[PDB]
Design a protein around this ligand. Sequence first.
Ligand SMILES: CNc1cc(F)cc2c1[nH]c1ncc(-c3cnc(C4(C(=O)O)CC4)nc3)c(-n3ccc(C(F)(F)F)n3)c12
Ligand code: NA
Length: 189
Amino acid sequence: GLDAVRKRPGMYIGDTDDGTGLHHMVFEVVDNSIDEALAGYCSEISITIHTDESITVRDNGRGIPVDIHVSAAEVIMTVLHAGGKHGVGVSVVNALSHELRLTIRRHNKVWEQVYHHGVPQFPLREVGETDGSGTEVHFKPSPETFSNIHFSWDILAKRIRELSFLNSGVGILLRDERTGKEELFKYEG
Ligand SMILES: CNc1cc(F)cc2c1[nH]c1ncc(-c3cnc(C4(C(=O)O)CC4)nc3)c(-n3ccc(C(F)(F)F)n3)c12
Ligand code: NA
């Protein structure tokens, strides 16, 4: 389970001391929005660095399926092994965040779930009406995992430029609330 991730984090997320693992936290979450853009359902992605060095990734895709009739969203946020025999998954990000809030806008409803170190505080639950669809993940990297909790504008921006070329017409906004800086990365092909 996620306990093993918390015990050997660099094995899952990358080096936790040289900046690799910390920024991989963002890139693992973002990859899901990129997949949603490649699928043709997402045209806007934003990545926000907050003053407390937490991160919000938000997209305007279909939203994670809820599939309650344990929610599908809880499965993808908490299960490490999908079964059987590259890319570690958002469950690793969850395990290594001291708190993470997932908000889904889908099928006229807003669903949310909160976790601490990957452990759900409560089940995914509906909390209101919405007119959009999409997914938002707000995570706070664990300072007990990363001795340096500070994000690098240059590192994120370099990777976002590479990502932008893969999806023409998909805007990726990088917003740094620590400094007031923001930049829209948008490739037109
Ligand atoms: C920050 N945004 C974000 C994070 C994350 F962490 C997962 C997703 C995400 N944005 C998404 N937007 C869409 C999907 C999605 C929706 N529907 C499918 C389905 C399809 O067949 O295309 C019906 C199964 N796959 C992916 C999604 N999800 C990424 C994984 C998953 C899922 F389905 F496994 F839960 N949803 C994510
Ligand atoms: Na949408």
